[PDB]
């Protein structure tokens, strides 16, 4: 009896979905199908820099008076950008539902990009990037994306290269804004104490104006810097995509893999439009580097060859307990709702997820794992003291067993 997420797309193309909950606090967001994948290397940081500029004032609400409004009701304002999606979300009370929607309308259209601000946000972005290098796992995952999707718009980062950041102007931004902010590529998602008819009327009142070959590459990239205390290594293979159901099975396998040797093991299934990265990013000391790998590759081949029913049942329980991702909290659900409408075109209910989980057994798990892991060329990204990290022949030979 999962609460349905009623959806009401506009003629402009603005899908308006919402799910009501007891919480008297509601989270409302706008999702846009626009990321670094839609950028063409001349505007590689346009989405990030617009995400910085989007809260610095609009035409109707000039400057900090705008954020004074979102202080006045005590609401929280957040935004994020990925390689495929951009989100602007507000967590507020239920009774403040209209003005929040109106605020979101300004943020998506009628936004004002001040030239003064552009220089200030350039120094912010430039500096952050100049210090972003500090976060290793971000460096390793960016390296993995670059070496796995070389020559494609999926290699380039969300932030872009410092070059573009410095070389960006209002008009360029205006373009990205006027090009990738179309109404049919937009979802107004609401979760929590909201009524769907009131939210649909508010979307009709404001926001009714919005205008109406991906390739994986196996490659060894190695950023060696021996002064760092720890090494971060990510190994991935090509993922299926958003719409392919065996993702669910792969999620179970990821669960079964879990994390057993050197510290900081983990597993990811990053999905983009009919592509993705499925793999693991461990981080460790000089010696463990290899074994962990060796360790890690063995587990993958075990999931390709010797999966039993007990670990499959454990992975199914871990995945179901992971449906808590949906939970009931306004934010997470809203977020989930946001993607559902952008990626699948519909909100998949938790009962359908439970059905797709319970149809997974050990035989189809090792079949799908052999389809996606066995004898595949991986993408490897290492950063730190990575001399004992094995080169591409040893990893590629560890991607299969002679028995």
């Amino acid at each position: 009896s999962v609460p349905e997420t009623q959806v009401s797309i506009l003629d402009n193309g603005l899908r308006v979905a919402s799910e009501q909950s007891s919480h008297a606090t509601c989270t409302v967001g706008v999702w846009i199908d626009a990321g670094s994948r839609y950028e063409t290397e001349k505007n590689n940081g346009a989405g990030y820099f617009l995400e910085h500029l989007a809260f610095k004032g609009t035409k109707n609400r000039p400057g900090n008076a705008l954020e004074k409004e979102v202080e006045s009701i005590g609401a929280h304002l957040n935004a994020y950008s990925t390689r495929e999606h951009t989100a602007y979300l507000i967590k507020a009370l239920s009774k403040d539902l209209p003005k929040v929607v109106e605020l979101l309308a300004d943020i998506v259209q009628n936004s004002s990009l001040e030239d003064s601000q552009i220089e200030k946000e350039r120094d912010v972005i430039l500096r952050e990037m100049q210090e972003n290098d500090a976060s290793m796992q971000n460096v390793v995952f960016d390296y993995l994306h670059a070496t796995a999707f070389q020559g494609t718009p999926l290699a380039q980062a969300v932030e872009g290269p410092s070059e573009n950041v410095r070389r960006l102007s209002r008009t360029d931004l205006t373009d990205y804004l006027n090009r990738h902010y179309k109404a049919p590529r937009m979802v107004l998602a609401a979760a929590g104490g909201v009524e769907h008819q009131q939210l649909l009327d508010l979307a009709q009142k404001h926001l009714s104006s919005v205008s109406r070959p991906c390739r994986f590459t196996g490659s060894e990239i190695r950023h060696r810097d021996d002064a760092l205390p720890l090494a971060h290594v990510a190994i991935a293979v090509e993922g299926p995509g958003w719409a392919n159901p065996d993702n669910v099975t792969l999620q179970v396998a990821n669960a079964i893999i879990g994390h057993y040797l050197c510290q900081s093991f983990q597993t990811f299934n990053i999905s983009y439009s009919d592509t993705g990265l499925l793999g693991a990013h461990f981080v460790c000391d000089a010696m463990s580097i290899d074994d962990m790998v060796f360790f890690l590759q063995g587990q993958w081949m075990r999931l390709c060859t010797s999966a039993t029913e007990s670990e499959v049942t454990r992975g199914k329980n871990i995945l179901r307990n992971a449906l808590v991702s949906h939970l009931d909290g306004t934010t997470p659900v809203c977020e989930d709702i946001g993607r559902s409408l952008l990626t699948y075109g519909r909100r998949i209910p938790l009962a359908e997820w439970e059905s797709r989980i319970q149809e997974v057994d050990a035989q189809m798990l090792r079949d799908i794992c052999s389809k996606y892991f066995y004898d595949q060329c991986p993408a490897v990204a290492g950063y730190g003291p990575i001399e004992q990290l094995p080169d591409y022949n040893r990893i590629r030979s560890g991607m299969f067993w002679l028995r």
Binding site: H223, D391, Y392, N393
Partner: protein, 54 residues
């Protein structure tokens, strides 16, 4: 010819072994070279770049 045969009764048999050896080496040398160049292509394409943090 006879004395020659005497001094090497296996002259004929050998030359047959040598013909089979030439055919087998003509089959096997480019294939082993191709396997070596597969397993050495990885490095032979490796591109190094120096990026001092500067």
């Amino acid at each position: 010819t006879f004395l020659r045969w005497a001094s090497e009764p296996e002259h004929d048999h050998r030359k047959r072994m040598g013909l089979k050896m030439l055919l087998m080496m003509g089959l096997l040398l480019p294939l082993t070279y191709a396997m070596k160049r597969h397993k050495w292509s990885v490095l032979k394409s490796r591109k190094l770049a120096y990026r001092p943090p500067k």
